[PDB]
């Protein structure tokens, strides 16, 4: 019906500023250290 | 008629405020601490 010259345009529904736009194509119209290895009792203990 | 209730609530808040600023060093000036004497182990350790 609406198809024009081999083009299948059929599958279409047919029934501030106020600009006007064209329809169908819109455009303007833990762990804490332990004592060892912490450097005491490694220089100490006079007993 | 509300005056005495105001007194009661003021007294409550002021009690809390007085308690907040209290420290034992001020009220108990003769509070004890952990004094000790210099002993033999100090001298042995110094020599070592």
Q: By C-alpha distance, which of A22, A13, A25 is closest to A2?
A: A13
From chain B, pick out residues whose CB is under 8 angstroms from the CB of A46.
41, 44-45, 47-48
From chain A, pick out residues whose CB is under 8 angstroms from the CB of B44.
46
CB B45 within 8 A of CB A46: yes
Q: DSSP letters along B1-48, please?
A: --HHHHHHHHHHHHHHHHHHT--HHHH-TT---------HHHHHHHH-
B47/A46 touch (CB, cutoff 8 Å), yes or no: yes
Q: Kindly state whether A41 is in contact with chain B, defined as any CB-CB distance less than 8 angstroms.
A: no
Method: cryo-EM
Spatial distance between the Cα atoms of B22 and B1, rounded to a whole number of angstroms = 34
């Amino acid at each position: 019906x609406x198809x024009x010259x081999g083009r299948x345009x059929x599958x279409x529904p047919x029934x501030x500023x106020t600009x006007x736009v064209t329809x169908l194509x819109x455009x303007x119209x833990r762990x804490y250290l332990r004592f060892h290895x912490x450097x005491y009792x490694x220089x100490x203990x006079x007993x | 008629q509300l005056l005495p209730l105001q007194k009661a609530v003021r007294g409550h808040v002021l009690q809390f405020e007085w308690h907040q600023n209290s420290l034992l060093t001020n009220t108990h000036p003769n509070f004890l601490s952990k004094i000790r004497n210099i002993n033999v182990q100090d001298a042995l350790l110094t020599n070592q």
